[PDB]
Structure formats: C-alpha cells, structure tokens
Design a protein around this ligand. Structure first.
Ligand SMILES: CC(C)(C)C(=O)N1C[C@@H]2C[C@H]1c1ccccc1O2
Ligand SMILES: CC(C)(C)C(=O)N1C[C@@H]2C[C@H]1c1ccccc1O2
Lengths: 268, 265
C-alpha cells in the first residue's frame, strides 16, 4: 500500500515528458538518467524514491512510481494540466483574487506539511508550484534539490541528457550557508509578490552582479509595480517574510494562522 | 507558540456560560472547559501539564486547537477556540437544512482532520457528531471533549455506543486501532444524511449491542433525502465487521476528494 510502486518502461504506451500508463492512466515522466548502467547506487536511489513516496499531501506532488532499469532512471508523477504557477499568471485569462488567495493558502499548507516532515525545499519558486485544471496547486521539486543521489545521477559524466530571484540573500554569493525553514519563507514572499504582480521581479535590473549585490544590500521586489488591487495585509505579509534577518521572518504555521482567517473574511 | 500557554483566570474579563464562553484580554473570544474546580490536589499537575503539552502538539485546520491551559490552586481548565454553530448534530437538527455541497465539504474536512491525527499516532477512540464542532461558515474541527486520548484530565474530570466499532462492544480490554475510528466515521456519514442519531435513539441494551456485533447497522432506508451512491458504498465499506476490510482515512481521501470536486461542489 504505502510501498514504492516500481514501474517498468513496458507499462507505458507512448527529459520531462507526458506518458500514458496501460491501466492507471495519464502521468508525467521525468527521466533523470539515460546511458550506461551502474548498479552500485541503485539501492541508494531506490531508498530516496522510498523517501519521496512517504511525502503525501493534497498540495504536494505525489510520486506515482519509479523506473529503475539497465541504463534508464525515471521518476513518475501526476499530471498537472495548467503547468507551473508563472505560466498561469502570464496567461491571457486573468486569474481572480479569490483563486489567488486560495493558491497562496494552498502553498502555505503544502510548505507547512514539508517543514513538519523535516524537508527544507531550498528552491521554492513558481516553476516548482504546479497547477491543475481546477486551479488547485501542488508543490514540486523538479530540480531534485531535496534528493542528493538522484541529483548526482542527473549531473553524471556519462548521462546522455537557475533563477536567483526567489533565493534568500544569505544564500546569494555564499555556497557554505546551510538552508533553513526561513530560506523557503523568503522564497514564499517573492512568490506572493509574483502572484499579484503577474510577472517575475526585478525587470529594471541591467546585470546579474548588480542584482545579487542589490538584494544582499536590502533591495526587494517593487511594490509599486503591482498594477492589480493587492490588499494591505498581503503587502505586510510579503514585507515580513522577505526580512534580511531570518529570525524576523515567520514560520509557515505562523503564516497560516494569520492568512487563513484573512482568506475566509476577505478573499473567498 | 510551540509550547503550552499556561494561562491565568485573571487573563479573562468575564466568563459567561463546565463549558463556558470567555474573553481573553489580548487574544479575543475563546471557550473554557473547566474540568475540575474545588480543593487543590498536587501529584497530578506534572502529568496534567505533560498531557496538555501532548494536546498542544496537534495543530491542524480541522482539529480543535488548545489555546492554553489553566492549572491553578483548585481550578483546572482547557482553553480552546470558539466554534459558533456548536456540534455537528446541532447543525444537522437545525430548522435550515444544510445542502449537499456543504455536507460533502464537511465529510472531506472530517477525513482531512482524522488523517492528520492518525498521522500523528493519535487514535480518537470516540469520534461522533458531539466531537465535531462547526464554525459560522460551516467549516468543521474535530474535538475530544470527553478526553478519551488524555487519561489524567479524564480521571480528573470523573455514553453513546452507536459510533463504537463491534470489536469494542463487550471487549473493553481490546486496544483501539485506526480502523476503530473509521467505523465511527461510517456512522457519522450515516448521521450527516439521516439528520438524526441512529437506531431510533434506542437505549444501548444487550439486544442492540449483540445485534451490532452480529452484523446490524444503521438503517440506510431511514435516509429520506438524496444521498449519492458513492457515499452509501463508503459507509457500508467503513462499517465492515472485520477491521482489515475497512479503509484508512488516506485511502478514503484519495477517492473522496475527486468525488467531492466533480460531483458535490
Ligand atoms: C517527484 C518530485 C521529486 C518531482 C516531487 O516533487 N516530490 C516527491 C516528494 C514529494 C514531492 C516533493 C516536493 C518538494 C520537496 C520534496 C518532495 O518530495
Ligand atoms: C482541547 C480538546 C481536548 C477539547 C481537543 O479537542 N483537542 C486537544 C488536542 C487537539 C484536539 C484533539 C482532538 C482529537 C484528539 C486529540 C486532541 O488533542
């Protein structure tokens, strides 16, 4: 029941790709490695897929299974029709405030679950917030930031196969700094901004070193760039969550206790 | 935040009605369940505080939050959040009939809440409509008002068998499981659509007890309003005699959530 479903390539009728399972239906296959086989790390890879399978929550992307074969390594996850959050925000159909409120709440719920399971995301951004046809979201880890062996497998010498806007300032120009829960909270602040801006931040930045050094100095996404009606409470929340000092930023349970009654009274 | 807030009676401005409504000076409207009042007796306080610490761990939108605890000379109280519309049965028996879309959401919220508690190693043991509180916007939270999970407060404090699984009827020594709560959820499912307590409110006599043990269940034909086929199958599945036949709440949620979205809302 709770075990990892080991899948085979032969289960699929027919590198992130859409894939149809013979009984079970339409799925998404992220093929991590294709090349010469090495069975030495298969035990560790499978154990990481077991860890992936344990993280079950309505706002977290479920691993439906894993293909571990001679030379091919793939993760199989559920289909999300509308794609990532930024694709939805940049679309010609404008997403209403009530849905945006629910999205934010769902992101908080999902991040609160993961932190409760001892999982720091390290790489929360609109690209990792997938959206289904009914505008409900699920948090993903598409670049395998939380999963060392699959991440090493992806960047392997024989394998025949990022955005700094949401990264907390403590991690900009500092590879040694160990990510915390508050690292993801910073990212959530900029995602909050993006949701109401309907765009990526820092458009007026001319160079990368300019931007990096500006963010480290205290510079943040422009609140005056928000053309839509964003509430005062949400502007306070993002301002709180993007504080320079990580101790000043709240926890996701902290965010949820404030935001949920606001969503109920105002947004829905 | 994160630790049990030891509160004082002096933090409350008044306490209008032992469950009573109470206003905190800095934190607004709350509910005070005063468990014991009278002569003070230490040698439970260490254990009582530790149990209140266990209560404090359980944070979830569909679970009643313990906002704090009063442990004073003679007075012992649990302080929890206010749910305006009262328990689920009060809402179901009200003159305004609750629509199917809200009932679907209630069921989903009950599942979410129960799934959280099982995930935290907490068997309820006493799930029923009296322990399902309802806010002004018809969202629910699961409660443990009889203190079934908290032995010392329950002993400090000191009868519906309609939601109790047959394995517990006439076997008080039997250790509860997750499937015990799933049985209870089945009868709650029945109650939600029946709009009443099951078995014609008959006294929980040996005839009834032994009938339930033998296979007897709440009458599905007593549901006069429209209940979907899926929900009738679910309650029938969840009240199976054999606990191994009954699903898990995660099992229920995986099937029920898409059903709620397509059909019920
Ligand atoms: C399959 C894939 C790696 C893409 C994923 O997104 N997840 C697997 C589990 C659950 C979900 C997930 C999200 C975020 C962090 C870890 C994590 O781990
Ligand atoms: C305060 C009171 C005892 C009435 C309660 O309902 N709960 C405290 C925690 C959270 C919530 C709760 C619900 C169900 C089981 C345990 C439990 O424990």
């Amino acid at each position: 029941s709770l075990n990892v479903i080991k899948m085979k390539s032969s289960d699929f009728l027919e590198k992130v790709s859409l894939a149809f399972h013979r009984t079970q239906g339409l799925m998404i296959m992220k093929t991590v490695y294709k090349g010469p086989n090495c069975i030495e790390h298969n035990e560790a890879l499978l154990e990481e897929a077991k860890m992936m399978n344990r993280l079950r929550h309505s706002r977290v992307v479920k691993l439906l299974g894993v293909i571990i074969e001679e030379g091919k390594y793939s993760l199989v996850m559920e289909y999300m029709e509308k794609g990532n959050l930024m694709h939805v925000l940049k679309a010609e159909m404008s997403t209403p405030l009530s849905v945006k409120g629910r999205i934010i709440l769902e992101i908080i719920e999902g991040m609160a679950y993961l932190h409760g399971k001892g999982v720091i995301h390290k790489d929360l951004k609109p690209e990792n917030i997938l959206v289904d046809n009914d505008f409900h979201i699920k948090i993903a880890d598409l670049g395998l930031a939380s999963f060392k062996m699959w991440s090493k497998l992806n960047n392997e010498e024989h394998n025949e196969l990022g955005t700094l806007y949401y990264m907390a300032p403590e991690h900009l120009n500092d590879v040694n700094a160990k990510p915390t829960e508050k690292s993801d909270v910073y990212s959530f602040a900029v995602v909050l901004w993006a949701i109401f801006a309907n765009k990526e931040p820092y458009e007026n930045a001319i160079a990368e070193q300019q931007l990096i050094m500006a963010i480290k100095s205290g510079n943040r996404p422009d609140v005056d760039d928000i053309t839509e009606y964003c509430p005062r409470e949400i502007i306070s929340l993002m301002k709180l969550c993007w504080e320079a000092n990580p101790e000043a930023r709240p926890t996701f349970p902290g965010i949820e206790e404030k935001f949920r009654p606001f969503y109920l009274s105002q947004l829905e």
